[PDB]
Amino acid sequence: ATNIPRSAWDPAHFNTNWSDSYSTEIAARRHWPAKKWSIG
Amino acid sequence: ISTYELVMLALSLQGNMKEAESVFSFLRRHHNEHVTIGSFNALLLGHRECRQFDRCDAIWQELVDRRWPRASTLTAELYLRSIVDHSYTPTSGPLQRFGNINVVEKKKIPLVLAQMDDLGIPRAHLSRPLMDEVEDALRKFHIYK
Amino acid sequence: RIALLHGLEPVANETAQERDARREKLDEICERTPFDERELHTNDDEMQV
Amino acid sequence: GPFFQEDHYFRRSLRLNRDGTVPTAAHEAPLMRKIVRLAQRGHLKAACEEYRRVTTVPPVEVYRALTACCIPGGLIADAVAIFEDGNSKLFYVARDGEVLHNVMRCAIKAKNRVRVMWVYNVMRGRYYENVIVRAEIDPIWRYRIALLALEYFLDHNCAEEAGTVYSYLVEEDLLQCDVHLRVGLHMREALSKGKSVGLSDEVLRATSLVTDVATVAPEVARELYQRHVEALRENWSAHGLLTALDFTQKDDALPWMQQNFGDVDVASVLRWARFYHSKDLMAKDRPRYLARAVAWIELLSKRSHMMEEAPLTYMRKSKP
Amino acid sequence: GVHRVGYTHPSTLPVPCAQRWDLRLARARIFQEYIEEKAPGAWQLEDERS
Amino acid sequence: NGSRIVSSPQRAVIVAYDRQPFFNPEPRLVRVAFQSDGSVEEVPLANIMIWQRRYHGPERTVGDESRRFSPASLRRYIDVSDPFNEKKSKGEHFLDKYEAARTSEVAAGKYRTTKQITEIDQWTRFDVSRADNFRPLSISHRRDYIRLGYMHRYTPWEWIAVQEADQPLIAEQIRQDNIGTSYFFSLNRYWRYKARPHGYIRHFDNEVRDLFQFVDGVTPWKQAQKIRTYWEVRAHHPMPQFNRP
Amino acid sequence: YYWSRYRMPTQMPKFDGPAPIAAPQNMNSTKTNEFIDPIDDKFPLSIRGPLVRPDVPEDQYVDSWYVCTSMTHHLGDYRPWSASAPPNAYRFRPYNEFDAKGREYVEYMRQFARYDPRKSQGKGQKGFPFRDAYLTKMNEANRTTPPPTLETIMDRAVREKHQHARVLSPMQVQRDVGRSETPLPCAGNIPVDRSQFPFCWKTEDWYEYEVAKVRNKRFVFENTEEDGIHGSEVTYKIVLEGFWDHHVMKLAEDVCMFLRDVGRQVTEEKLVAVRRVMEGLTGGAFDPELIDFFNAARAGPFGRPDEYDAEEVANFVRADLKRLEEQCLNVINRCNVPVPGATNIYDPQVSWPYVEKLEPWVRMAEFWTSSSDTSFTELEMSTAHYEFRKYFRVIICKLPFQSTEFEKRMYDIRHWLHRQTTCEFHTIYRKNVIHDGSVFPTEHDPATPTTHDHHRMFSFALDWQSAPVNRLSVARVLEGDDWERVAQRLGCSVDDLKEANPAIEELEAGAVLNVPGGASRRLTSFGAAPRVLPLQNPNNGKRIRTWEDAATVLDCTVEELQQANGHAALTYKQTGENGEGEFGPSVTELNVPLSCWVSTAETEFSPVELVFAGDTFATIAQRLRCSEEALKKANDGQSDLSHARFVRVPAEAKAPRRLLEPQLRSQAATDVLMTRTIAEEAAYGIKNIPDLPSNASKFPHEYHTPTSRFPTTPKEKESESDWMAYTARYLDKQFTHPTEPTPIYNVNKLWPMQQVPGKIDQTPFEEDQTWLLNPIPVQQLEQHHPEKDLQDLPFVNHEQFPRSLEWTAP
Amino acid sequence: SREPESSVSQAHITVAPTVDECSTLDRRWESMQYWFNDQHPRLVIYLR
Amino acid sequence: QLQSRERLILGTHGAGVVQH
Amino acid sequence: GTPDTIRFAWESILQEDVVRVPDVTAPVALFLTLVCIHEGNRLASVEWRESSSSLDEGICSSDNTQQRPLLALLNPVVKRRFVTKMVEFLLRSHSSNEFSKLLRKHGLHDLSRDVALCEAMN
Amino acid sequence: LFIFIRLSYVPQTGLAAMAQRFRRRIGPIGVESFQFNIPTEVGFVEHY
């Protein structure tokens, strides 16, 4: 039908769960502190 | 049936596809044995009018699926003219640096002709002005091995 | 959970009489059926009470 | 290139001579005789194994026979391929009306609505063949193939596509090529005797066709009226749409018919539906012709569809 | 042992049944299989490593 | 009956399921218990329907629990020695009594481990040249395209459209078919547009009959006569025959 | 120029510095390594540890080309080990349950527990059950579970009854020291099945299992009719080839998201279509084409032809469309499920489509580096191994319906693909191939049997035609014919012959009739009869003299007479009455070409039938498909058959035996090849030419045909068959039993090698002596295989394209 | 502007019987969940 | 299920993140 | 007693991948229902042959049935009144470590060591 | 049960004519008693 599909421009087709470009590649490269424990 | 198909064709030359496809819904859901191809023609004309060149192709493949009713040569002309008007429909400025893109919507045209050959609607039984752009597209996007 | 459980889901083409019949139907079991506590999920910065 | 020796060897020989003719040679004539004789006998694979030795171009009759053999078995596939091998590949030798007629027959016996239309499509041609390569088809052959297409389709109830082919019939005004073939023959009789000839409505109504087709007028019209009044009684029935057919007035039947379904020429529908596989129904199976030409007029005439519509139901409009 | 390859018709047995050499012949007909006849019976080696 | 006989949709609820690709192979038998009386049987996920609540997300079947807004939108704080608040008292304990007071608890470690939220991750040049996780409709605006250090992760729709249009479509990509296979002609079709068999000799059946015919048509016995065997000449050795050892 | 792309936008680095700290600037005798970092290396390992690149999932690094280093495909942007694992994943395991071999084998045991054989069909090596589990199930002696030793029962009992303490299974004994191992393992009560575990099996089980697994790799019907993920109609496996696996790892993500957005739209289109179609299905929504296709059958299930209306086909098409929508919406649901956060394209169960890895083509090659011409040793020691890699990825779109428009959208990724990356499209699409009656007949065996001679070498091209058989679909009417007599002659029903010849009402002589394919007595073209050409009646009334005479009386071309006629061509001299009697038949008759032959019943269908052993005329009618009364009428009225050896089958038979194999190539189409050798053999009188000397068998090992094969079978004695016949003829000439009493059936001693009957053969030997003591040679010269011989050696193994070695050809 | 075509099963769905869905109830080919639905059973409508 | 989507995601030009 | 075409149509119906029960019209529906009613009046076990809770009881065999709530069916306002008079009887009847231990093994250690108090007070 | 084998057994002609009409399954669909409609699987590569 449309050579450029619907789901890409359609705001009605916009993901309620579109988790964006910097979001995951930022919250991923973190490493939460290795010292949660006083001893370990 | 002529009244319902003219309901559709009047809405289709009005531009009110949101009402024409509604008529078609009532029909398909109630009297599909009484839907002929002139009503699908009303759709392929009205979506062409409202530039809904996605719904146009949707119903063309719908009809390639449902080979009942058979697509009159007017319907093949309708859809091909839709695709050519659409492939001349030009994109925006942020898209128009490298070329006029919807020229690619002139790629299905040969596949349209294949589905015509398989639906039994002779391509020579078109218009010559429309066959002008279509022979152009066949030397544009079409090649033999 | 209980609504899909016994199948009291809302219906696309349902009318008002069926709607409120189903409503008072589900009210009967919900108000009488235990409320599930393991589902009680504490979100961000929420107090677990 | 990929195909270098074959393509350039083909084209460095075997070209159309300025006489406009196709390259038919000397050493391929006996092999062409072998092919045409075998295929006419019906030995399809034998003729095909021999065709496998066609080095130069075959004359058109070789394709005529190699497609002709396919008719009884219904080899639409083998037949379409025999057509395409000369069509556009061998200077369009295969683009001749009788080869198209054979392949159309195969489409009939294989029961192929889409192959009937493909063959009518090659018949219609385009500019490239019809003008550049000048492989056109004689208008009488155009008409014979078009009548075969209509005779297939309106016998196969394919109303939309039959109406399409008849649309081209109307466009070319070959509706009357039947009677005109009849008069051209009648006059090849008069001229062969040595008598001068004449072209007018007189010879038109004078051919046997409209003489015998004007007598069936009450028979066809009564049937048409009765079919559409019992259909409405079936499905409202106090009135019909159909105008007054003057029953006992056996004269005003066909003019009443054209006033009733003026979208098509019943003069040509009745003179087409007369023959039923080379069998004159109007001499032998006259009720068959009656229910045959009636089916044909009811399908070719779009107005017939209107007054044969069903009672649908009425959708009330709506607001949120 | 030195056994004569014998094959009895589907007519001699008091129950007819399609016999396996005839099936071999039907298969070497369908898929154009050359039947090498000097193929000795004592040489049905298979490539163990493979 | 052959491996199953399957029926209409009938409501159920899951009482036992394993996400493990080992505990739950292909296909993943959903051990379910239906709504009629609670009959427990294993029916795979092919015969299950979920009440989607959204058309997109990976888990459509749970809602969208809205969370509390913060007017201090960038002023939140997160302890990191325990991010997940696992170190808290949810109930007063019987060991709560021996608790030495907040005296000498000088630097209550959580108060000195909590971070404002901005701190945990940095917006580094990878984030300033970060490439997208979708097919961008156009990057004309991308004046940071190449000199600034960016390259798209996915060719944009626009340049895909250019690359589709600029070039044709081969007619041998459609594979229409309504007639069937032509058993007799299509293979013996014209010698130019012929189906050259390829591979072994055992596929050249027409050409080989042809080769026999040509070779007999040219090669005379008055030429193939003299051609000797090895034995027909070896015959005249003083020892033409001696058994191998 | 083309040298101007090689320009530059800065100013250069200026060599205005001194050597950095501890750079190896050459003093007198410092052995200098320019490469090693002068500080960061000598910095002790007690501090720094042996890391030379971050501790981070190795799939983030790529081994550089030309640089003995390793760089990361994302340019130094890192994601730590804990991004390559589930949250809090134990040892960063995929599922915290088991390790790399624990997962696979828990899974094998589970797949076996849910294994179904009627479900395994049509699947490749995936439907193959557990090799060890299926085998331990298959074993015989594992059917019995040995009990515990009675001493062990007494021992456990002296502990439990007498000694008043319970014995525990190892999973129950608390081996722990400080904390109590409670709860105990729930396995503390598993049974013991010698039929399940331990894994015991037999060897033919192992072998047949593994080789069957191996051979059935390809036999994958990828388009089943399953629900959801295993259901498809057209499988496009686009295998993208790239020089670097990171190129194709990201390329496949690009194309997989492109085609997920495509496939989503194309099934959104097809799905709205299907929905609006299924929308209003009832007895008032249907086509005549579909009824005429639903009811184009001569008989069905009720013992009577089925009439399918608009509604019996309505439920059919609605069930089908329910199936298609279920599969389509399963697709779309897989097409929305991958999100930027946790998209897993290496598992289809989550995503449509899924990028299947393909093991890379890898061309490791030893090669010298030195050009020393004197020493081979110093070339050898210089051997460097280098690899031409070419990795791939396979995108599997299993779409349940072929959409040429989507395929159009797929083909032009062939252009927007990335750099040094290409695409092979595998399409596996369901089709319809018709089997059909006239042309591909399921007739009885012929009368004449096609022995091994008809399938010899080059018989594939000389002795056979290219099937199918051309059957003369035009039948000539006999003079005194009837309407039902031509049907009783052609094996058709009268009305079906009417309907395949619907242009006639009453049959006149000399006409041609279209043979319906439903006819069972249709004759092959050019029947087996060499047509006669007698010189009894010319127009002269005495003899036919010239040559073109036969051209006209036979209706052929002159080169079909003068080719087919070799002998008479040299005896007639265009006159004939100078025909020399050395070739008798050629002067009195001129042998007809095969091209003008004619076929009829007595040359095509067999007049005679073989009698079985237990054949009653009831069974003869049941076989040759006529009436027992017709058989007793055309068989001189015989009663019992064991008193005959043939049977006359009258032409009333609908399914008659044919006289020769209808596909066989008649010898005439081969004489017309050997014409000039035929002509010269006739003209030069070669009675024969011997191929071997007359004493050929006196010397066994000199004369070995390029066909001759080993072990060379010995010449047979009288009755060496078995021990009963051996003692009967050879030891006790007066023994009671003729031979070991033999089943009247077939003993395929030579198993499974189907061997030529009438050929005296050996079986594969038993005693390991006869191979030592046979005359069998060893493979001395080069070692060829007809396919491998293209590559000419192992070391120089050639390949046309860099395809994967695990390539699953469509 | 057209919505994203819902993934909802319009085929397996149990929908409220309109007067113009029961005006044809004696004619439709449906399954036994359609006839034996708990919510709007349709066999009881047919038998009444 | 974004609230007031018919004015925000559909008809608010800048997706509700951009202030014009 | 039935032509082989019907059994062969049956094996052809069955040898599929996912065979589906096709939809029916209501005459056919009710017909089959009544068929099976009469048939389930035959094929049932005696405990299900007269009074059962569903049509395939006494017929379906390997059914993993989940039937543990027997007291939960009871109106819990009666079970409160039930245990109020049962557990105090237990508490005053015997003194052991056979209720403290059960509380401890189900985890109720707070109640368990205190049950030990009343078990020493017994 | 005979009603069932009626509701369910789709003759090969109907199966092929449904899958060609609505699933665009290519290849002709035969109506003569000879023609056996066989759904096969054709696999090939198209490397450009």
Name residues whose C-beta falls within 8 Å of residue D255's C-beta, 6 or more positions apart in sequence. Answer: none
Report residue J69 as tokens.
């709530």
Q: For the beta carbon of residue B84, count every other beta carbon within 10 angstroms.
A: 19
Q: For the beta carbon of residue D146, count every other beta carbon within 10 angstroms.
A: 21
Report residue G130 as tokens.
């557990």
- A27 vs F118, F127, F209, CA distance in Å? 12, 12, 74
Nearest to H37 by CA among H14, H20, H19, H21: H14
Report the SS3 class of residue G723: helix
Report the SS3 class of residue G62: strand
Residue located via tokens 């209720």: J99
Written as one letter, the residue type at C46 is E
Which of F3, F34, F48 best probes binding to J when mutated, by most J CB atoms within 10 angstroms? F3
Q: In this structure, what DSSP letter does residue D133 have?
A: I
- D250 vs D267, D269, G386, J95, CA distance in Å? 16, 19, 100, 121
Name residues whose C-beta falls within 8 Å of residue C42's C-beta, 6 or more positions apart in sequence. Answer: C48
Name residues whose C-beta falls within 8 Å of residue G16's C-beta, 6 or more positions apart in sequence. Answer: none
Nearest to D184 by CA among D197, D173, D202, D170: D197
Of G460, G610, G762, the CB nearest to E41: G762
Distance CA G409, CA F173 (A): 11
Helices (H) and strands (E) in chain J, counts: 6, 1
Report the SS3 class of residue G71: strand
- G84 vs G60, G80, G99, G247, G251, CA distance in Å? 10, 7, 15, 20, 20
Phi–psi pair at D78, nearest 5 degrees: -55, -40
Confirm if F78 and F114 have CB atoms less than 8 A apart. yes
Please give the distance of CA G591 from its chain centroid, rounded to a whole number: 46
Q: Judging by beta carbons within 10 Å of its beta carbon (0-12, 13-18, 19+), is residue D184 exposed, middle or buried?
A: middle
Chains that touch H (3 or more CB pairs under 8 A): A, C, F, G, J
Written as one letter, the residue type at G14 is K
Distance CA G453, CA E35 (A): 8
Distance CA G193, CA G195 (A): 5
Experimentally determined by? cryo-EM
Report the SS3 class of residue G104: helix
Q: Do E32 and G708 touch (CB under 8 A)?
A: no
Please give the distance of CA A22 from its chain centroid, rounded to a whole number: 7
Name residues whose C-beta falls within 8 Å of residue G224's C-beta, 6 or more positions apart in sequence. Answer: G122, G230, G231, G232, J17
Residue K2 sits at the chain G interface (C-beta within 8 Å)? yes
Q: For the beta carbon of residue G311, count every other beta carbon within 10 angstroms.
A: 19
CA within 13 Å, CB half, G770 = 12
Distance CA A2, CA G713 (A): 74
Chains I and A touch (3+ CB pairs under 8 A): yes
Measured distance between the N- and C-terminal CA atoms of chain E, rounded to whole angstroms? 28
**Preceding peptide of F27 cis, ω within 30°:** yes
Q: Tally E–G CB contacts below 8 A.
A: 134
Residue located via tokens 């009887």: J89
Distance CA F124, CA B69 (A): 62
DSSP string, J22-70: --B-HHHHHHHHHHHHHHHTTS--HHHHSS-SSTTTTT--S-EE----S
Distance CA G119, CA G127 (A): 8
Residue located via tokens 């030793």: G149
Buried b (16+ CB within 10 A) or exposed e, F24-49: bbbbbbbbbbeeeebbeeeebbbbbe
Distance CA B24, CA B27 (A): 5
For residue I12, the chain A residue with the least C-alpha distance is: A11
Signed CA dihedral, J100, J102, J107, J111: sign only: negative
With a CB-CB cutoff of 8 Å, which residues 76-115 of chain B face chain D? none
Kindly provide the resolution of this structure in angstroms, with one decimal.
3.5
DSSP string, G455-516: GSTTHHHHTB--SS--B--EEEPPTT--SHHHHHHHT--HHHHHHHSTT-SSPPTT-EEEPP
To the nearest 10°, report the CA torsion of G678, G680, G684, G686: -40
Q: For the beta carbon of residue G39, count every other beta carbon within 10 angstroms.
A: 10
Report the SS3 class of residue G430: strand
Please state at what angle helix B53-65 crosses helix G245-279, rounded to 10 degrees: 70
Report CA Rg, chain A: 19
- D292 vs D211, D289, D306, H22, CA distance in Å? 19, 5, 20, 41
Q: Judging by beta carbons within 10 Å of its beta carbon (0-12, 13-18, 19+), is residue G517 exposed, middle or buried?
A: buried
Q: In this structure, what DSSP letter does residue G83 have?
A: G
Name residues whose C-beta falls within 8 Å of residue F109's C-beta, 6 or more positions apart in sequence. Answer: A38, F81
Q: Do G318 and J3 touch (CB under 8 A)?
A: no
Name residues whose C-beta falls within 8 Å of residue E47's C-beta, 6 or more positions apart in sequence. Answer: none
Confirm if D109 and D71 have CB atoms less than 8 A apart. yes
Which of C1, C2, C4 best probes binding to F when mutated, by most F CB atoms within 10 angstroms? C4
- CB-CB neighbors (< 8 A) of H26 in chain J: 25-26
Q: In this structure, what DSSP letter does residue D27 have?
A: T
Strand partners, F31: F16, F42
Q: For the beta carbon of residue G602, count every other beta carbon within 10 angstroms.
A: 11
Q: Do B66 and K24 touch (CB under 8 A)?
A: no
Distance CA F205, CA F46 (A): 50
To the nearest 10°, report the CA torsion of G743, G748, G749, G752: -160
Contacts 24+ apart (CB under 8 A), G53-60: G54/G78, G55/G81, G56/G80, G56/G81, G57/G81, G57/G83, G57/G84, G59/G84
Report CA Rg, chain C: 15
Question: Under the phi-then-psi rule, with left for phi > 0, alpha for psi from -120 to 50, and beta for the rest, what region is E7?
Answer: beta
Report the SS3 class of residue G63: strand
Q: For the beta carbon of residue D47, count every other beta carbon within 10 angstroms.
A: 29
Confirm if E14 and G744 have CB atoms less than 8 A apart. yes
With a CB-CB cutoff of 8 Å, which residues 143-202 of chain F face chain K? 170, 173, 175-180
Q: In this structure, what DSSP letter does residue D113 have?
A: H
- D61 vs D48, D75, G370, G468, CA distance in Å? 14, 19, 72, 26
Distance CA G652, CA G630 (A): 7
Nearest to G98 by CA among G108, G545, F123: G108
Strand partners, F34: F12
Strands (E), G331-471: 354-367, 384-399, 421-430, 433-435
Of E11, E25, E44, the CB nearest to G611: E11
For residue F234, the chain G residue with the least C-alpha distance is: G693
Strand partners, G609: G647
Distance CA E24, CA G809 (A): 28
CA within 13 Å, CB half, J66 = 14
Distance CA G613, CA G624 (A): 16
3-state SS, G600-666, equals CHHHHECCEEECCCCCCHHHHHHHHCCCHHHHHHCCCCCCCCCCCCEEECCCCCCCCCECCCCCECC
**Preceding peptide of G198 cis, ω within 30°:** yes
Distance CA J30, CA J38 (A): 12
Q: Do F157 and A8 touch (CB under 8 A)?
A: yes
Distance CA D46, CA G595 (A): 8
Measured distance between the N- and C-terminal CA atoms of chain J, rounded to whole angstroms? 79
Confirm if B9 and B41 have CB atoms less than 8 A apart. yes
Distance CA D86, CA D99 (A): 11
Q: Do B54 and A6 touch (CB under 8 A)?
A: yes
Confirm if G262 and A8 have CB atoms less than 8 A apart. no
Name residues whose C-beta falls within 8 Å of residue C17's C-beta, 6 or more positions apart in sequence. Answer: none
Distance CA G392, CA G397 (A): 16
Distance CA G462, CA F201 (A): 13
- CB-CB neighbors (< 8 A) of F157 in chain A: 4, 8
Q: Do A11 and I10 touch (CB under 8 A)?
A: yes
Of F186, F190, F206, the CB nearest to D54: F190
Written as one letter, the residue type at G525 is S
Report residue D76 as tokens.
């639409």
Residue A1 sits at the chain B interface (C-beta within 8 Å)? yes
Residue G323 sits at the chain J interface (C-beta within 8 Å)? yes
Report residue F183 as tokens.
């058993």
Q: Do H33 and F8 touch (CB under 8 A)?
A: yes
For residue J68, the chain F residue with the least C-alpha distance is: F38
Residue F206 sits at the chain H interface (C-beta within 8 Å)? no
Nearest to B63 by CA among B82, B39, B87, B81: B39
Distance CA F205, CA F202 (A): 7
Of G400, G402, G436, the CB nearest to K35: G436
Distance CA B115, CA B105 (A): 16
Please give the distance of CA D153 from its chain centroid, rounded to a whole number: 9
Nearest to F46 by CA among F6, F99, F79: F6
- J96 vs D11, D45, G781, J89, CA distance in Å? 112, 102, 94, 14
Distance CA G63, CA G44 (A): 26
Report the SS3 class of residue F9: coil
Strand partners, B143: F170
- G704 vs C20, F237, G505, G700, G708, CA distance in Å? 98, 20, 69, 8, 5
Report residue G755 as tokens.
């061997």
Please give the distance of CA F102 from its chain centroid, rounded to a whole number: 59
- CB-CB neighbors (< 8 A) of F7 in chain G: none
Nearest to G292 by CA among D258, E5, K21, D288: K21
**Preceding peptide of B69 cis, ω within 30°:** yes
Name residues whose C-beta falls within 8 Å of residue C45's C-beta, 6 or more positions apart in sequence. Answer: F68, F70, F76
Report the SS3 class of residue G427: strand
From G83's Cα to the closest Cα of chain A, the distance in A is 6
Buried b (16+ CB within 10 A) or exposed e, J16-45: bbbbbebbbbbeebeeeeeeeeeebeeebe
Q: Where are the alpha helices (DSSP H) in chain D?
A: 5-11, 29-41, 44-51, 60-68, 76-86, 97-109, 113-124, 127, 139-155, 159-172, 177-193, 201-206, 208-215, 217-234, 254-260, 266-272, 286-300, 302-307
Q: What element of type H or E holds B73?
A: helix B73-88
Q: What element of type H or E holds G313?
A: helix G312-336
Written as one letter, the residue type at D197 is V
Distance CA D99, CA J109 (A): 100
Phi–psi pair at G717, nearest 5 degrees: -85, -170
